[model samples]
Target: SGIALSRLAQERKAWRKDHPFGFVAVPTKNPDGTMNLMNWECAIPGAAGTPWAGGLFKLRMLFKDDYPSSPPKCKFEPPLFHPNVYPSGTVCLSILEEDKDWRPAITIKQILLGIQELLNEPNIQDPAQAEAYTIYCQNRVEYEKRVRAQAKKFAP
Candidate 1:
């Protein structure tokens, strides 16, 4: 308990001090006076100049007790319309895969950065949603338009 909470608190502090230009994370309180480090409210601005530009995407990340050994769960708060994001807003990425690339060494900033990149360049091979994937493949214009519209809807 001490190890995970203490280490995670430090990481959150470092993130607040030196976070990326567009990403932010804040701990969610549990009404018990003690902060619930496991659950956090996060937001990431869409990469500038891209179809997703100007969008402020909000999400929730819940870290488990076995965080160092397992990956946390990241889900979009209001849901996202993307090929790589599930209908329920869960982000599907390799780096977050515990059995694959996830490592305790990786920081929250790294994961948010990776998600930012994925916003523009999705992994076509592993499509989490079909509608976005099909439009992105068959009609680039429509795909860009859709992304732009969504961005506008979620503009900060």
Candidate 2:
């Protein structure tokens, strides 16, 4: 807990210095009247050169008691149409998988950066959403079209 606390604290202070463009992660206040620093509301913009480039997506990250020992859970708000995103809006990424790919050394910045990259080059190997996966895998043009439409729908 100490390690995660210090790291997250430092991150919060230094975030703007190194934050990726079009992405922002803000810690939310706890109902218990203390600064929890474990829950966050994130704003993610589509990476440049992707069909989703114009969209701004919101996400929620929940860190458990075993954070650093385990990865935080990141879920999109209101869901997004993407092959690697679950119907429930949970993102499916290797680094977020605590059982296998997650490591204590992996930082929050890395996770969000990785997710930013995923928007452009989706991993068809580990598909999550059926419709998004099918369209993404079958037709590039149609996939781009749908993605662009979603980009507009969610644009900030």
**lDDT score for residue 64 of model 1:** 86
Residue lDDT tens for model 2, 1-156: 887788788877877678877888989887887787899899889877778888998999888877778888899998888899999999999899888799888877888888878878889999989999999878989999998998999999
**What is candidate 1's CA lDDT for residue 146?**
96
Which pairs clash (backbone N, Cα, C closer than 3 Å) in model 1? none
- Tens-digit lDDT track of model 1 for 96-154: 89998999888889888888899899899999989999998999899999999999999
* lDDT, candidates in the order shown: 0.89, 0.86
Supply candidate 1's per-residue lDDT for 119.
87
Q: Which candidate is the best by TM-score?
A: 1
Off by over 4 Å in 1: none
Per-model TM values vs. the true structure:
0.96, 0.91
CA RMSD, predictions in order: 1.0, 1.6
Clashes of 1: 0
Q: By lDDT, who's the top model here?
A: 1
